[PDB]
């Protein structure tokens, strides 16, 4: 029993290999408004995972974890999400995390500050981590203190590149000596436009600046990030990150070596 990674929440979520945490503050609820309706104006319809934020203080955390995914083909994760609030004010933050090969949680690769618009919005994830390696998508709500709803009514894992996000190509470790720049060549397939934010995130390390985006064709660009005048207190793991109006794409972790 492997898992596609995805879930309509029509069956119990453990059917999809989704799980929760007992190490945090609560749990997501699983609802179906067709089988038990609700006259709550701020409630969405259908089958979904819900956070009810009523009588929850600020700071409270709750994780819905995807099965570990061990993909061969370049693929796409998209989820569909909903937020509502009685106040014109948000019920919580929603964060998406990726741990790769059982690693540290790291930072949210994608997040909304949860503005309560009671509509559904798509977001797609383009993760470059493949068999024999694996990763785990983790949905984390953190409550604002005000009442309302955050919901996810379906996650889909498709076997093709993401449409609204470029995806990165394997990026190799970088090795240099001392007082001299270290260049990361974040090479992608797809299109990038104005709004798009592009960045190299290093754990425990101040982020290298975007140095340039060099577009080679309608389907290929390289974003390059320069860590200048390098020392030992610079060495660690780096990753390519693109945020577009549609999703987030992330390369594998490249490592930095200093001689
Ligand atoms: C998001 O969180 C909110 C806080 O937990 C929920 O609001 C609560 O919703 C319930 C609705 O069931 C409401 O209280 C009802 O329950 C009482 C306790 O049993 C009861 O006295 C009333 O309901 C009915 O049940 C009794 C027998 O049990 C019968 O005598 C009657 O038939 C009676 O009508 C009562 O209305 C709360 O007022 C409300 N709590 C708060 C603090 O706001 C939301 O439901 C939840 N959203 C969803 C849809 O998940
Ligand atoms: C991702 O790809 C892995 C590649 O291994 C081989 O898979 C078979 C089908 C064949 O196409 C080979 O040429 C290919 O390299 C898959 O690994 C599995 O391969 C077998 C079929 O499941 C299986 O007997 C074997 O035990 C298994 N594991 C290994 C390490 O070889 C893997 O299944 C695949 N995952 C998916 C479904 O994406
Ligand atoms: C979370 O997302 C916002 C955009 O909503 C971004 O600018 C902010 O800095 C992000 N923080 C992270 C990366 O956790
Ligand atoms: Na939980
Ligand atoms: Na659903």
From Swiss-Prot:
Outcome recorded upon mutating residue 219 to E: Abolishes dimerization
Chain ranges of the MAM domain: 2-164
Residues bearing carbohydrate: 52, 72, 111, 229
Subcellular location: Cell membrane
Annotated ranges, domain Ig-like C2-type: 166-257
Impact when changing residue 220 to E: Abolishes dimerization
SS bonds (residue pairs): 7-16, 76-162, 186-240
Domain of life from the UniProt record: Eukaryota
Family: Belongs to the protein-tyrosine phosphatase family. Receptor class 2B subfamily.
Described function: Receptor protein-tyrosine phosphatase that mediates homotypic cell-cell interactions and plays a role in adipogenic differentiation via modulation of p120 catenin/CTNND1 phosphorylation. Promotes CTNND1 dephosphorylation and prevents its cytoplasmic localization where it inhibits SLC2A4 membrane trafficking. In turn, SLC2A4 is directed to the plasma membrane and performs its glucose transporter function.
Subunit: Homodimer.
Protein name: Receptor-type tyrosine-protein phosphatase mu
Gene: PTPRM
Interval of the full protein contained in this chain: 21 to 279 of 1452
């Amino acid at each position: 029993e492997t898992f596609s990674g995805g879930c309509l929440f029509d069956e119990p979520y453990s059917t999809c290999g989704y799980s929760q945490s007992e190490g945090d503050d609560f749990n997501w609820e699983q609802v179906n408004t067709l089988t038990k309706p609700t006259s709550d104006p701020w409630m969405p319809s259908g089958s979904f995972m819900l956070v009810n934020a009523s009588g929850r203080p600020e700071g409270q955390r709750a994780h819905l974890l995807l099965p570990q995914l061990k993909e061969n083909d370049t693929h796409c994760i998209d989820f569909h999400y909903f937020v509502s609030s009685k106040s014109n004010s948000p019920p919580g933050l929603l964060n998406v995390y990726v741990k790769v090969n059982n690693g540290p949680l790291g930072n949210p690769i994608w997040n909304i500050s949860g503005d309560p618009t009671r509509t559904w919005n798509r977001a797609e994830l383009a993760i470059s981590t493949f068999w024999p390696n694996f990763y785990q998508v983790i949905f984390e709500v953190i409550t604002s203190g005000h009442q309302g709803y955050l919901a996810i009514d379906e996650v889909k894992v498709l076997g093709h590149p993401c449409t609204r996000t470029p995806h990165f190509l394997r990026i190799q470790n970088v090795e240099v000596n001392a007082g001299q720049f270290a260049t990361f060549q974040c090479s992608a397939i797809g299109r990038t436009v104005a709004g798009d934010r592009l960045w190299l995130q290093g754990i425990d390390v101040r982020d290298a600046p975007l140095k340039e985006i060099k577009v080679t064709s309608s389907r290929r660009f390289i974003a390059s990030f320069n860590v200048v005048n390098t020392t030992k207190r610079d060495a660690g793991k780096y990753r390519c990150m693109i945020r577009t109006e549609g999703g987030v794409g992330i390369s594998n972790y490249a490592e930095l070596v200093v001689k």
